[PDB]
C-alpha cells in the first residue's frame, strides 16, 4: 500500500501523522540541580516515546514489517528521532534548544548541546521546510537499523519505501523551483545531516548509559529497555 | 518487552 | 579562494583517483589470528601504517589544504575510522562473507569473536560490503564518498567553503551516474542510497571507537602514539 | 603538540 502513494499523498500522510509537542515539568520557581534538570529531559523523552511508537505505525510501509523488525527499527532510531524533532522545533530560537514550550535552554551534556545547536543552525541556514523534515524523520526510522537485522525480503521493502521518500524529497524541491543541480545538491545536504544526527545519537546513548550507572538521574522502564537494545 | 506490546495495541 | 571549485567534474574524479592511497599488507605470518592480542596486534599495526597514508591522501583531496591546519586536524580526527572502514568495505566487496583487511589478512566473523565486541562490528562491516556489492558500487563513486566523509563528518562541530566543496562532490557523483547512462530518477535514487550508507558507516565508526578505547584500557596491546592521539580526540 | 599537526605539515 505504501509503494503506490504519490508524492503529495506521502507528504500528507507524514504531515497528518506528526506527533504532538509535549510539555516538560519545568518550574522556574523551583530550584534545579543538573540531576533534576536531566530528569526533566528523560521524563519528557519517555512520554514522547509513547507518541513516537504510535507515530511510527503511521509511517507508510512501517507496519508491513514483522513486529520483530518494527521493534528493531525503533530501538535503533529512537534517540535520533527525538533529536531531529528537537532541532526542528529549535530552528527559530538561535542559540537555544526548545525541548518543550516551557523548557527553552541555552548552552549555559554540554558537548551534545553544542552539536544539537549546530544542527539546528544548519537547518536554519538551509531554510529546512516542514515537508522535508517529516521526510527526513521517516528516513531515519526506516534507514538506521536496516543493516543490523527471509529477513532479506523485509530489507528490500524498506529499500523501496526509502526510494519512494527520495522521490518525494525531489518532488518537493522541484515544486520549490530549484534547478536539477540544486535539487541534487540540497538532497545531498539533507542526507549528510543524517550522519551528524546518527553521531549525536551514539554519543547521547553513551552518556545515557553512564547516567544509568551513576543511578542519580531517574530513568523509566521503557527508556532503560531502549537503552539496553544498544548494549 | 515494553516496546513490543506498545506496538501491538 | 579555492582551486577545487574551478575543477571540472572529470578533473575532480581524476584528482581523487590519483590521490588514492595504496593497499597495504599485514605482517606475513601464516597463522590465522585467533586471539585478542594477535588480532588486535595486526589490526592496530595496519591502522597505524594506513593512517600515515590517509594523512597524505587528505592533503590531495581538492579543497582540503585550503582549510587551516586546525580544521584539517579536526576533520581527520573526526573521520579517520570511518575512512579506514569504508576502505575496508570497498576492498572486501568482491569477497562475500570475508573482510579483506589486507590482501594477506582476510578475516571472517568467526575470528571477530576473539576480540570483545568485534563480531558485531564485523557483522556490520560485512553487511555494508554486501550492500555495496549489490549496488555495483564503482571505484569513481567510492572515492567521492570517502572524500565526502572526510569533509562532512566534522563540519558541523565547527564553513561555507567545505559546503561548496561538498556540493562540488555531489555534482561529481551525479556526473558519474549520468556518464554511466542512468536516468534522472535513477540518479537521485542512487545518490540517496549511497549517502544513507554514510549514516551506517558513522554508526560503525562510533561503535568501533568505543571498543577501541575499551581495548586501550584493557592494555591488551601497545598502541602507537599516533593511534592513541586519534582515539583520544573522540574522548 | 599533536603528531597529526606535524604529519599534516609533511
Ligand atoms: C546526557 O546526554 C543526553 C542524553 C539524552 C538527551 C536527551 C533527552 O531527552 C530528549 C528529548 C527530546 O525531545 C529531544 C532530545 O534531543 C532529547 C535528548 O537529547 C540529552 C542529552
Ligand atoms: C577493538 O576495536 C577495534 C575497532 C576497529 C579496529 C580496526 C582497526 O584497523 C582497521 C584497519 C582498516 O583498514 C579498516 C578497519 O575497519 C580497521 C578497524 O576497524 C580495530 C579494533
Q: With helix as H, strand as E and coil as C, how does chain A read?
A: CHHHCCHHHHHHHHHHCCCCCCCCCCCCCCCCCHHHHHHHHHHHHHHHHHHHHHHHCCCCCHHHCCHHHHHHHHHHHHHHHHHHHHHHHCCCCCCEEEEECCEEEECCCHHHHHHHHHHHHHHHHHCCCHHHHHHHHHHHHHHCCHHHCCHHHHHHHHHHHHHHHHHHHHHHHHHCCCCHHHHHHHHHHHHHHHHHHHHHHHHHHHHHHHHHHHCCCCCCHHHHHHHHHCC
Q: If you take atom 8 of ligand 2, which residue's CA is the nearest one?
A: C43
Distance CA A205, CA A199 (A): 10
Residue A40: CB partners within 8 Å, gap ≥ 6?
Answer: A24, A25, A26, A32, A99, A103
Phi, psi of A213 (to 5 degrees): -60, -40
CA dist D5 to A166, C5, C58, C231, D10, Å? 40, 26, 13, 15, 9
DSSP state letters, chain C: --GGGGS-HHHHHHHHHHHPPP-PPPP---S---SHHHHHHHHHHHHHHHHHHHHHHHTTSTTTTTS-HHHHHHHHHHHHHHHHHHHHHHHTTTSTT-EEEETTEEE-HHHHTTSTTHHHHHHHHHHHHHHHHHTT--HHHHHHHHHHHHHHTTTTT--HHHHHHHHHHHHHHHHHHHHTT--HHHHHHHHHHHHHHHHHHHHHHHHHHHHHHHHHHTT-SPPPHHHHHHHHTT-
Handedness of CA A56, A51, A134, C153 (dihedral sign): negative
- C-alpha cell, A67: 513486529
Domains of chain C: 1-235 (1.10.565.10)
**C42 Cβ below 6 A of ligand 2:** no
Torsion of CA A73, A129, A24, A138, to 10 degrees: -10
Distance CA C116, CA C118 (A): 6
Question: Running DSSP on this structure, what letter comes out for residue D9?
Answer: T
Please choose, from the candidates A191, A114, D2, the residue with its C-alpha nearest in 3D space to the C-alpha of residue C158: A114
The number of angstroms, rounded, from the C-alpha of C75 to the middle of its chain's C-alpha atoms is 13
Which residues of chain C neighbour A174 with C-beta distances below 8 Å?
none
Method by which the coordinates were obtained? X-ray
Phi, psi of A97 (to 5 degrees): -115, 115
Distance CA A85, CA A133 (A): 9
From the annotation, which residues of C make up the binding site for 17beta-estradiol? 50, 91, 211
Question: Running DSSP on this structure, what letter comes out for residue B1?
Answer: -
Cell 597495504 sits at which residue?
A: C24
What number of C-beta contacts closer than 8 Å exist between A and B?
26
Distance CA B3, CA A49 (A): 9
Please choose, from the candidates A91, A68, A77, A216, the residue with its C-alpha nearest in 3D space to the C-alpha of residue A137: A77
Cell 562491516 sits at which residue?
A: C125
Distance CA A140, CA A146 (A): 10
Pairing status of strand C105-107 against strand C99-102: antiparallel
**C89 Cβ below 6 A of ligand 2:** no
Distance CA C44, CA C42 (A): 6
CA dist C185 to A99, A113, C60, Å? 38, 37, 32
Phi, psi of C99 (to 5 degrees): -115, 115
Cell 602507537 sits at which residue?
A: C224
Cell 578533473 sits at which residue?
A: C11
CA C87 to ligand 1 centroid distance, Å: 33
- C-alpha cell, C171: 555534482
| C-beta atoms surrounding A109 within 10 Å | 11
Residue C12: CB partners within 8 Å, gap ≥ 6?
Answer: C4, C62, C168, C169, C172
Cell 549511497 sits at which residue?
A: C194
Distance CA C192, CA C189 (A): 5
- C-alpha cell, A192: 549528510
Residue A68: CB partners within 8 Å, gap ≥ 6?
Answer: none
- C-alpha cell, A69: 523488525
Radius of gyration of chain C (CA): 18
Please choose, from the candidates A38, A90, A56, the residue with its C-alpha nearest in 3D space to the C-alpha of residue A212: A38
Cell 584539517 sits at which residue?
A: C72
- C-alpha cell, B2: 515494553
Distance CA A141, CA A76 (A): 8
Residue A6: CB partners within 8 Å, gap ≥ 6?
Answer: none
Question: Running DSSP on this structure, what letter comes out for residue D1?
Answer: -
CA A195 to ligand 2 centroid distance, Å: 20
Name the residue facing A195 among C153, C192, C210 (closest C-beta).
C153
Handedness of CA A187, A188, A189, A192 (dihedral sign): positive
Handedness of CA A48, C158, A106, A218 (dihedral sign): positive
Distance CA A39, CA A216 (A): 9
Please choose, from the candidates A167, A197, A9, A181, the residue with its C-alpha nearest in 3D space to the C-alpha of residue C206: A197
List all residues of chain A from 117 to 176 with a beta carbon under 8 Å from chain C. 118-119, 122, 139, 143-144, 147-148, 159, 162-163, 166-167, 169-170
Cell 568505543 sits at which residue?
A: C210
Cell 569533509 sits at which residue?
A: C151
Distance CA C176, CA C62 (A): 17
Distance CA A15, CA A129 (A): 12
- C-alpha cell, A26: 519545568
Which subunits have 3 or more CB–CB pairs within 8 Å of chain C?
A, D
Amino acid at each position: 500500500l505504501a509503494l503506490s502513494l504519490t508524492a503529495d499523498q506521502m507528504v500528507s500522510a507524514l504531515l497528518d501523522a506528526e506527533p504532538p509537542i509535549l510539555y516538560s515539568e519545568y518550574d522556574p520557581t523551583r530550584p534545579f540541580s543538573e540531576a533534576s534538570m536531566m530528569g526533566l529531559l528523560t521524563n519528557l523523552a519517555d512520554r514522547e516515546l509513547v507518541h513516537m511508537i504510535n507515530w511510527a505505525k503511521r509511517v507508510p510501509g512501517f507496519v508491513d514489517l514483522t513486529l520483530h523488525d518494527q521493534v528493531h527499527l525503533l530501538e535503533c532510531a529512537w534517540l535520533e528521532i527525538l533529536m531531529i524533532g528537537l532541532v526542528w522545533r529549535s530552528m527559530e530560537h538561535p542559540g537555544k534548544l526548545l525541548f518543550a514550550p516551557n523548557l527553552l535552554l541555552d548552552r549555559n551534556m554540554v558537548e551534545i548541546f553544542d552539536m544539537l545547536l549546530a544542527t539546528s543552525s544548519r537547518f536554519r541556514m538551509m531554510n529546512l521546510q516542514g515537508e522535508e523534515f517529516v521526510c527526513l524523520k521517516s528516513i531515519i526510522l526506516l534507514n538506521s537499523g536496516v543493516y543490523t537485522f527471509k529477513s532479506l525480503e523485509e530489507k528490500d521493502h524498506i529499500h523501496r519505501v526509502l526510494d519512494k521518500i527520495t522521490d518525494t524529497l525531489i518532488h518537493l524541491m522541484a515544486k520549490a523551483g530549484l534547478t536539477l543541480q540544486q535539487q541534487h545538491q540540497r538532497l545531498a545536504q539533507l542526507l549528510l545531516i543524517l550522519s551528524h544526527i546518527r553521531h549525536m545519537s551514539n554519543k547521547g546513548m553513551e552518556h545515557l548509559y553512564s547516567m544509568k550507572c551513576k543511578n542519580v538521574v531517574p530513568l523509566s522502564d521503557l527508556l532503560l529497555e531502549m537503552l539496553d537494545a544498544h548494549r | 518487552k515494553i516496546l513490543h506490546r506498545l506496538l501491538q495495541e
